[PDB]
A paper describes a structure:
Adenomatosis polyposis coli down-regulated 1 (APCDD1)—a conserved single-span transmembrane protein containing a large extracellular domain—negatively regulates WNT signaling and plays important roles in hair follicle development, CNS vascular development, and glial differentiation. The APCDD1 ECD consists of two closely apposed β-barrel domains (ABD1 and ABD2). ABD2 contains a large hydrophobic pocket that accommodates a bound lipid. Collectively, the results of this study suggest that APCDD1 serves as a negative feedback regulator of WNT signaling by neutralizing WNT ligands.
Therefore, we produced, purified, and crystallized a fusion protein between engineered maltose-binding protein (eMBP) and APCDD1, collected X-ray diffraction data to 2.3 Å resolution, and used molecular replacement with eMBP to obtain phase information. Although the resulting electron density map provided a good fit to the eMBP half of the fusion protein, the map of APCDD1 was of insufficient quality for model building. Recognizing that the N- and C-terminal halves of APCDD1 have ~25% amino acid identity and similar predicted secondary structure patterns, and, therefore, that APCDD1 very likely consists of two domains with conserved three-dimensional structures, we used this constraint, together with the RoseTTAFold prediction algorithm, to generate a three-dimensional model of APCDD1. Fitting this model to the electron density map of eMBP-APCDD1 provided the starting point for iteratively solving the structure of the APCDD1 half of the fusion protein. Intriguingly, we observed an electron density consistent with the acyl chain of a lipid molecule in the hydrophobic pocket of ABD2 in two of the four eMBP-APCDD1 structures (chains A and C). We suspected that these lipid molecules became bound following APCDD1 secretion from HEK293 cells, which were grown in the presence of 2% bovine serum, a plentiful source of lipids. To define the identities of the bound molecules, we extracted hydrophobic molecules from the purified APCDD1 sample used for crystallization and analyzed the extracted species by high-performance liquid chromatography (HPLC) coupled with mass spectrometry (MS). This analysis revealed stearic acid, a C18 fatty acid (i.e., with 18 carbon atoms), as the most prevalent species. Therefore, we modeled a molecule of stearic acid into the electron density in the ABD2 pocket; the subsequent structural refinement revealed a good fit between stearic acid and the electron density. Interestingly, this structural analysis also revealed different lipid conformations in the two APCDD1 structures, both of which exhibit multiple contacts between the lipid and hydrophobic side chains lining the ABD2 pocket.
Numbering used by the authors: 8 to 713, 721 to 735, 739 to 795
The structure:
C-alpha cells in the first residue's frame, strides 16, 4: 500500500517527490523518493531476493539485463498512452518484444563553455591544446570533465570508428566489437596526449570538473542536462553547443533514455503504473522535475514540442543524433566495466592505450568472472556455503523443479520431518518432463534418526529410518487401471477379486503390520534417507534470504536395484519451504500441495540443443562411488568435435585435487528422444585421453600398474605398442538444455550408470541426467 522510488542523485529527486505529494493528495498513497549510492547495482541484488524499490529510475542501457534476470515487470500501457510518447523512446525500453519500463527523458552530453572566457568555443578537439596554453597564460584552463566514468570519454573514442557493438540487420552483434578498432585507439590516444601534455588531469572526476567550470577556472566542460541547473546558480554566462569534432568526424555521444521500471516483486504495480502514466508523464509532472534539475529532451511529445524551443535542448538533440542510442542488451554492464578500466588505466599510464584497450575486446561482452577458469575456481557463483554439521532435517523440504529419476520418472518431492523424529514424504509422479499432468502420488510415512558423519562419503551424515506405511493415490482414471493391473501381475493376490482401483483413493502398498506388500510393482525404496547433508547460503549475511538445501541419497539408475542400493552420492537438493530462493516458483506450488491436490508446475517450453561453446560445473559434483569432481566441456559445432576436462578431488568442496582426465573426440547430433521427453539423443566417440596425476598416491599407483608418471605431468594413455583402458570408446548420450532464472543456459548430460559401468550400447543410454553445467566464456 506504498510507493518507493529510486532515482539517481544527479537528477531532480525533490521534483519527483513533489509529483509524489500530488499522489498523496488525490489517492492518499505515500510516495517516498530515495537516491541511493550506486543504485544501478544495488537494484540487481535487493531485487533478486524479492526486495527493492517499487519503481527504479535509470537509463535504458541497464534495463535489458534487469529483465533477463527477471527483476522487471512488463509494463501495460494503453495504445492511447503509447501515442503520447515518441516511438524511439519505446524502442529503447523494449526487451524480448516486451515493454519493460516507462520512457521519461532523452539525454546526451554536450559541450558547455564560458562565453566570457571563450566567446567562440573550439570546433575541433585538435585545437584544444593550443587554446589551453594560451588561456593558461591568464591562469585558467580550456577543458575539464569527469575522466572516471567512461560515459564522458566515449564520445571521443567513437569518433574515428570505435564501435561498442555492431548493429547487423536488427541485431546488436556481440561478436563484432570495436573498442580495439583503429578508430577507438585514436580517441583514447588523443585523450592520453592531453593528460600527458599537462592539458588535463587524470584525477578529475565529476565533482572536480563541476567545481572548476562553475567557478570559472575552466572554460569548457562535457556534461548532460542535469548539470545545467547548478551552472545557472553559478553566476557564470555559459553556452551549450555541439561537441568538438575529432579528425574531421563529429564526437558521437552514447544516447540514453531515462526510464522508470516497475519491480517484478512489487506488491503495488497498479499504483506504480498509475503514478507514472497519469501523474509523472504529464506536462505538469515532467516540468516539476525539469525545474529541479533539467531533464533536457523528454519522451512526452507534448512537453518536448515546447522544450525543443530552448537552445540547450536542441544542442542536446543535435549531439544525440550525431551520436548513437545506447543498446539495452544485458552485456552493457560488462562493456562499461571494461571501457572504464581501460580509460582509468591508460590515463594513469597503467596500461598502454593498445594494451589497455586490447583487454576491452577480451572483456567487452563478458565479465572476467563469467569465464570458465574463474567459475571453476569459485563455484556456486562464488557463494559462501556453510555446511550444517551436525545436520538438522526438521522442517518442510520441497523440490525446485520437475526432477527426473531413472526410468524415466518425472517427479517432485515434498518431505516433512517432524520433531518427534517422524516423517511424511510426498513423491508426486507425472507423465511428462513439464510436471503438469500428475499420474500417481506416493505417501511415505515412518521414523528417522540422524547418526554421525560418514567415513565413506566425506561431508555426508549417516541416518537410520523405519517405514510405517506406503500408500499410492491415482489422479487419472487411466492410471488407476494401469497400476492396479501392474500390481496384479507383480503380486497376484495382493488385490482381492472385483477390486479394480479407482482414482483419488489411497491404497496401501506397504504396511508394517502385515507381510502383504507390493512395493516391487513400482520398484520403490526409501534408502535415500540414509545419507544426509545440509548446505546453507546466507545472502547479504542475513538469516532472512537464507537458502537452505537438503541433499539426500542418490537413486539407482536401474529401478530393479534400488531395494539393495545403498547411497554413495546425492539427489538434486531440496530447498526449505521456509528458506528458499525468491525465484523458486515451484517451491511454493509444491509447498501448498497434498496427496489429493498435486502440485502443477509452471509450463516452460522445451529448448532446442545448442552445444556450441564452453560449459563448466556449478558445484563440486558428487558421482556414485563417492567421486568428487568438476567438469569443463568445449563443443565445436563447426566440425562436431568435443573436448572434456574432468577434474577429480578428494573433498566435497573440490580443493584437494587427486587426478585430472582430458578427453577429445567427435559427436553426432541425433534425434529427439521418445523414451525421455525433453531429451535429445547423441553418440559420442572418445578418441584421445590424457591423464594428469595430481598427488603422489595417484602417480605411484599408475607407475605400479603400468613414460613414467609424475605429479603435474599430463600423459597420453595411448602409446605406440595404460591401466587397461580401451580407446576408441563409444558412448550413447542424452542431453537437454534449459534456462535458469537470470537467463543463463544449463547443459544436462546423461546420468552415469550407478554401478560405475559405461553407456557403451544404445540400450544403456541414460533415462536421467547429471547436475547441470552452466555456460561460460573463454
Ligand atoms: O559511464 C558508464 C555509464 O554510462 C551511463 O551512465 C550515465 C547515465 O546515463 C546518466 O544519467 C548519469 O547521470 O551519468 C552516467 C555517467 O556517469 C549508463 O547509463 C550507465 O549504466 C553506465 O554505467
Ligand atoms: C561425455 C561423453 C564422453 C565421455 C567420455 C570422456 C572420458 C571418460 C572419462 C570421464 C567419465 C565419463 C563421464 C562423462 C559424462 C560427463 O561428464 O558428461
Ligand atoms: C509428530 O508431530 C507431528 C506434528 O505435530 C504430528 O502431525 C504427528 O502426528 C506426530 N506423531 C507422533 C507419533 O507423535
Ligand atoms: C491378474 O493376472 C493374471 C495373470 O496374468 C490374470 O489371469 C488375471 O486375470 C489378472 N487379474 C485380473 C482381475 O485381471
Ligand atoms: C575443429 O574446429 C576447431 C575450431 O573450430 C579446431 O581447433 C579443431 O582443430 C578442428 N578439428 C578437426 C578435427 O577438424
Ligand atoms: Cl546457446
Amino acid at each position: 500500500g506504498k510507493l518507493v522510488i529510486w532515482i539517481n542523485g544527479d537528477k531532480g529527486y525533490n521534483g519527483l517527490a513533489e509529483v509524489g505529494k500530488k499522489f498523496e493528495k488525490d489517492t492518499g498513497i505515500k510516495v517516498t523518493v530515495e537516491h541511493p549510492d550506486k543504485l544501478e547495482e544495488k537494484f540487481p541484488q535487493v531485487a533478486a531476493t524479492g526486495d527493492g524499490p517499487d519503481i527504479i529510475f535509470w537509463a535504458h542501457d541497464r534495463f535489458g539485463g534487469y529483465a533477463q534476470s527477471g527483476l522487471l515487470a512488463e509494463i501495460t500501457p494503453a495504445a492511447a498512452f503509447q501515442d503520447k510518447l515518441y516511438p524511439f523512446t519505446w524502442d529503447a525500453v523494449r526487451y524480448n518484444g516486451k515493454l519493460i519500463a516507462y520512457p521519461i527523458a532523452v539525454e546526451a552530453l554536450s559541450l558547455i563553455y564560458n562565453k566570457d572566457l571563450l566567446p567562440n568555443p573550439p570546433k575541433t578537439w585538435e585545437e584544444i591544446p593550443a587554446l589551453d596554453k594560451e588561456l593558461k597564460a591568464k591562469g585558467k584552463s580550456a577543458l575539464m570533465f569527469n575522466l572516471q566514468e567512461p560515459y564522458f570519454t566515449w564520445p571521443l573514442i567513437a569518433a574515428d570508428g570505435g564501435y561498442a557493438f555492431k548493429y547487423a540487420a536488427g541485431k546488436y552483434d556481440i561478436k563484432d566489437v570495436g573498442v580495439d578498432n583503429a578508430g577507438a585507439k585514436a580517441g583514447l590516444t588523443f585523450l592520453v596526449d592531453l593528460i600527458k601534455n599537462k592539458h588535463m588531469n587524470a584525477d578529475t572526476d565529476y565533482s572536480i570538473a563541476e567545481h572548476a567550470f562553475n567557478h570559472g577556472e575552466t572554460a569548457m566542460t562535457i556534461n548532460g542536462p542535469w548539470a545545467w541547473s547548478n551552472i545557472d546558480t553559478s553566476a557564470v554566462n555559459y553556452g551549450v553547443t555541439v561537441l568538438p569534432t575529432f579528425k574531421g568526424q563529429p564526437s558521437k555521444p552514447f544516447v540514453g533514455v531515462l526510464s522508470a521500471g516497475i519491480n517484478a516483486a512489487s506488491p503495488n504495480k497498479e499504483l506504480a503504473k498509475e503514478f507514472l502514466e497519469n501523474y509523472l508523464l504529464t506536462d505538469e509532472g515532467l516540468e516539476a522535475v525539469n525545474k529541479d534539475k533539467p531533464l533536457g529532451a523528454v519522451a512526452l511529445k507534448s512537453y518536448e514540442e515546447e522544450l525543443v524551443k530552448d537552445p540547450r535542448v536542441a544542442a542536446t538533440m543535435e549531439n544525440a543524433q550525431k551520436g548513437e542510442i545506447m543498446p539495452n542488451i544485458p552485456q552493457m554492464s560488462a562493456f562499461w566495466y571494461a571501457v572504464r578500466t581501460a580509460v582509468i588505466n591508460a590515463a594513469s599510464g597503467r596500461q598502454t592505450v593498445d594494451a589497455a584497450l586490447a583487454a576491452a575486446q577480451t572483456n567487452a561482452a563478458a565479465f572476467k568472472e563469467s569465464q570458465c577458469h574463474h567459475m571453476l575456481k569459485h563455484l556456486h557463483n562464488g557463494a559462501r556455503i556453510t555446511v550444517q554439521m551436525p545436520p538438522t532435517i526438521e522442517g518442510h523440504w520441497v523440490s525446485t523443479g520437475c526432477e527426473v529419476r531413472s526410468g524415466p520418472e518425472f517427479m517432485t518431492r515434498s518431505y516433512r520431518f517432524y520433531n518427534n523424529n517422524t516423517f511424511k514424504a510426498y513423491q508426486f509422479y507425472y507423465g511428462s518432463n513439464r510436471c503438469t499432468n500428475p499420474t500417481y502420488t506416493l505417501i511415505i510415512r515412518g521414523k528417522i534418526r540422524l547418526r554421525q558423519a560418514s567415513w565413506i562419503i566425506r561431508g555426508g551424515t549417516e541416518a537410520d529410518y523405519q517405514l510405517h506405511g506406503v500408500q499410492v493415490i491415482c489422479h487419472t482414471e487411466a492410471v488407476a487401471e494401469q497400476l492396479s493391473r501392474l500390481v496384479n501381475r507383480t503380486c497376484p493376490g495382493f488385490l482381492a477379486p472385483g477390486g479394480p482401483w479407482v482414482q483419488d483413493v489411497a491404497y496401501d502398498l506397504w504396511q508394517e503390520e502385515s507381510n502383504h506388500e507390493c512395493t516391487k510393482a513400482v520398484n520403490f525404496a526409501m534408502h535415500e534417507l540414509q545419507l544426509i547433508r545440509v548446505e546453507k547460503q546466507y545472502p547479504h549475511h542475513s538469516l532472512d534470504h537464507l537458502v537452505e538445501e537438503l541433499f539426500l541419497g542418490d537413486i539407482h539408475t536401474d529401478a530393479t536395484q534400488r531395494v539393495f542400493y545403498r547411497p554413495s552420492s546425492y539427489q538434486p537438493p531440496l530447498q526449505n519451504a521456509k528458506n528458499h530462493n525468491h525465484a523458486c516458483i515451484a517451491c511454493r506450488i509444491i509447498f501448498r500441495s497434498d496427496e489429493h491436490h498435486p502440485p502443477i508446475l509452471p509450463p516452460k517450453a522445451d529448448l532446442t540443443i545448442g552445444l556450441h561453446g564452453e560449459w563448466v560445473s556449478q558445484r563440486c559434483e558428487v558421482r556414485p562411488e563417492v567421486l568428487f569432481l568438476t567438469r569443463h566441456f568445449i563443443f565445436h559445432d563447426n566440425n562436431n568435435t568435443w573436448e572434456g576436462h574432468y577434474y577429480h578431488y578428494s573433498d566435497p568442496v573440490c580443493k584437494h585435487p587427486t587426478f585430472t582426465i582430458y578427453a577429445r573426440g567427435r559427436y553426432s547430433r541425433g534425434v529427439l528422444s521418445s523414451k525421455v521427453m525433453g531429451g535429445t539423443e547423441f553418440v559420442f566417440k572418445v578418441n584421445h585421453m590424457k591423464v594428469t596425476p595430481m598427488d603422489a598416491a595417484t602417480a605411484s599407483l599408475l607407475n605400479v600398474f603400468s613414460g613414467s608418471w609424475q605429479v603435474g605431468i599430463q600423459q597420453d594413455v595411448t602409446h605406440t605398442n595404460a591401466l587397461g583402458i580401451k580407446l576408441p570408446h563409444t558412448e550413447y548420450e542424452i542431453f537437454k538444455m534449459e534456462q535458469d532464472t537470470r537467463g543463463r543456459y544449463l547443459l544436462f548430460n546423461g546420468q552415469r550408470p550407478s554401478d560405475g559401468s559405461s553407456p557403451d550400447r544404445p540400450e544403456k543410454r541414460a533415462t536421467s541426467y547429471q547436475m547441470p553445467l552452466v555456460q561460460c566464456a573463454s
